[PDB]
């Protein structure tokens, strides 16, 4: 049974909401983004409407086989009526075909569904600007303090600096970048561009790849790994039997590999600066772990929220336990009395 936070008041509408089978009363299932635990449930044989992004689309046709008559694609930044109800889909700031929704309803409430975002000053010039908003159904997985890391752009940079040192030292150095979902591209681009390099991977990842609008994707990736000094590798092989292994492979054409782990927040965070990062290294591997984050910090949510001041906050992450929710409500009322909404 689907909870009442992915329930849109006052419509036949749901967010996220594909894993409780045929929802009572929905008319439209809107997907933010393709990340597997929101579309959970989706295959070739859903026959309800479903609305997203086109980048979203594209992924829904091609990976998961939804068939095309089902696939609503929106634009974005523009007003749409969906079932008698004007909607916006607005850019996240989070993967590739990420969207927030606006939605205007009957009686005149204004709701903002986040999805997983990464707020930014940018979005206090989009559309929603214009007009106020009663209900924020907010992605709050960084909701505390505790929870820093760099701009993106900063983490770039030290990759960027780091797999060009590396490799102008050594030559024969292979490049190896791990993934487990769409998201973080960034990554492995910027690395590859610096190395004069195209990327390799599967023809599992080249075909999601294929799905995402980048400009000249042709001129930037590849399934022939031999021609290729960055390679991509799912996430689980980012270890040193998986790397030791990988190497084999590529013919004696290499004598050294530095790896990059993308991950989330780590609490290394909490003492560490980026510019002084650090790898493991067992023998010619090394590991980097870098805080490449698609989602909020809290001073960036924060800031959000209070130039927004929505009249209630409803989170979608971190939901379970007392502890959780109690220590989110008492943020919210902290940034209401300080900013005097
Ligand atoms: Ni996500």
Request: proline share 5%.
């Given at each position: 049974?689907?909870?009442?936070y992915?329930?849109?008041?006052?419509?036949?509408f749901?967010?996220?909401?594909?894993?409780?089978?045929?929802?009572?009363?929905?008319?439209?299932?809107?997907?933010?983004?393709?990340?597997?635990?929101?579309?959970?449930?989706?295959?070739?044989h859903?026959?309800?409407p479903?609305?997203?992004?086109?980048?979203?689309?594209?992924?829904?046709?091609?990976?998961?086989?939804?068939?095309e008559?089902?696939?609503?694609?929106?634009?974005?930044?523009?007003?749409?009526?969906?079932?008698?109800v004007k909607?916006?889909?607005?850019?996240?700031?989070?993967?590739?075909?990420?969207?927030?929704?606006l939605?205007?309803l009957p009686?005149g409430?204004?709701?903002?569904?986040?999805?997983?975002?990464r707020?930014?000053?940018?979005?206090?010039?989009?559309?929603?600007?214009?007009?106020?908003?009663?209900?924020?159904?907010?992605?709050?997985?960084?909701?505390?303090?505790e929870?820093?890391?760099?701009?993106?752009?900063?983490?770039?940079?030290?990759?960027?600096?780091?797999?060009?040192?590396?490799?102008?030292?050594?030559?024969?150095?292979?490049?190896?970048?791990?993934?487990?979902?769409?998201?973080?591209?960034?990554?492995?681009?910027?690395?590859?561009?610096?190395?004069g390099?195209?990327?390799?991977?599967?023809?599992?990842?080249?075909?999601?790849?294929?799905?995402?609008?980048?400009?000249?994707?042709?001129?930037?990736?590849?399934?022939?790994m031999?021609?290729?000094?960055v390679?991509?590798?799912?996430?689980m092989?980012?270890?040193?039997?998986?790397?030791?292994?990988?190497?084999?492979?590529?013919?004696?054409?290499?004598?050294?590999?530095?790896?990059?782990?993308?991950?989330?927040?780590?609490?290394?965070?909490?003492?560490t600066?980026?510019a002084?990062?650090?790898?493991?290294?067992?023998?010619?591997?090394?590991?980097?772990?870098?805080?490449?984050?698609?989602?909020?910090?809290y001073?960036?949510?924060?800031?959000?929220?209070?130039?927004?001041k929505?009249?209630?906050?409803?989170?979608?992450?971190?939901?379970?336990?007392?502890?959780?929710?109690?220590?989110?409500?008492?943020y919210?009322?902290?940034?209401?009395?300080?900013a005097?909404?």
């Amino acid at each position: 049974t689907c909870p009442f936070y992915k329930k849109i008041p006052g419509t036949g509408f749901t967010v996220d909401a594909f894993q409780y089978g045929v929802v009572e009363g929905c008319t439209a299932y809107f997907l933010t983004h393709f990340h597997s635990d929101h579309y959970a449930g989706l295959s070739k044989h859903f026959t309800f409407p479903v609305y997203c992004s086109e980048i979203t689309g594209n992924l829904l046709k091609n990976k998961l086989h939804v068939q095309e008559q089902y696939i609503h694609p929106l634009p974005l930044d523009t007003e749409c009526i969906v079932n008698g109800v004007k909607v916006v889909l607005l850019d996240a700031n989070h993967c590739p075909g990420a969207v927030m929704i606006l939605f205007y309803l009957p009686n005149g409430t204004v709701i903002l569904h986040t999805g997983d975002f990464r707020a930014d000053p940018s979005m206090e010039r989009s559309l929603l600007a214009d007009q106020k908003v009663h209900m924020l159904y907010l992605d709050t997985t960084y909701c505390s303090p505790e929870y820093t890391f760099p701009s993106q752009q900063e983490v770039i940079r030290f990759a960027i600096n780091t797999a060009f040192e590396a490799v102008t030292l050594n030559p024969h150095a292979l490049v190896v970048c791990g993934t487990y979902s769409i998201g973080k591209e960034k990554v492995f681009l910027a690395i590859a561009d610096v190395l004069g390099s195209k990327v390799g991977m599967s023809q599992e990842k080249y075909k999601t790849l294929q799905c995402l609008n980048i400009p000249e994707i042709n001129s930037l990736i590849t399934t022939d790994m031999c021609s290729s000094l960055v390679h991509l590798l799912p996430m689980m092989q980012i270890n040193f039997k998986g790397l030791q292994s990988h190497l084999k492979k590529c013919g004696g054409k290499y004598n050294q590999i530095l790896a990059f782990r993308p991950t989330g927040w780590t609490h290394s965070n909490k003492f560490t600066r980026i510019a002084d990062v650090i790898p493991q290294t067992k023998g010619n591997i090394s590991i980097y772990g870098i805080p490449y984050s698609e989602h909020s910090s809290y001073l960036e949510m924060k800031r959000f929220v209070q130039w927004l001041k929505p009249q209630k906050i409803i989170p979608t992450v971190n939901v379970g336990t007392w502890k959780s929710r109690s220590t989110m409500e008492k943020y919210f009322r902290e940034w209401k009395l300080e900013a005097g909404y």
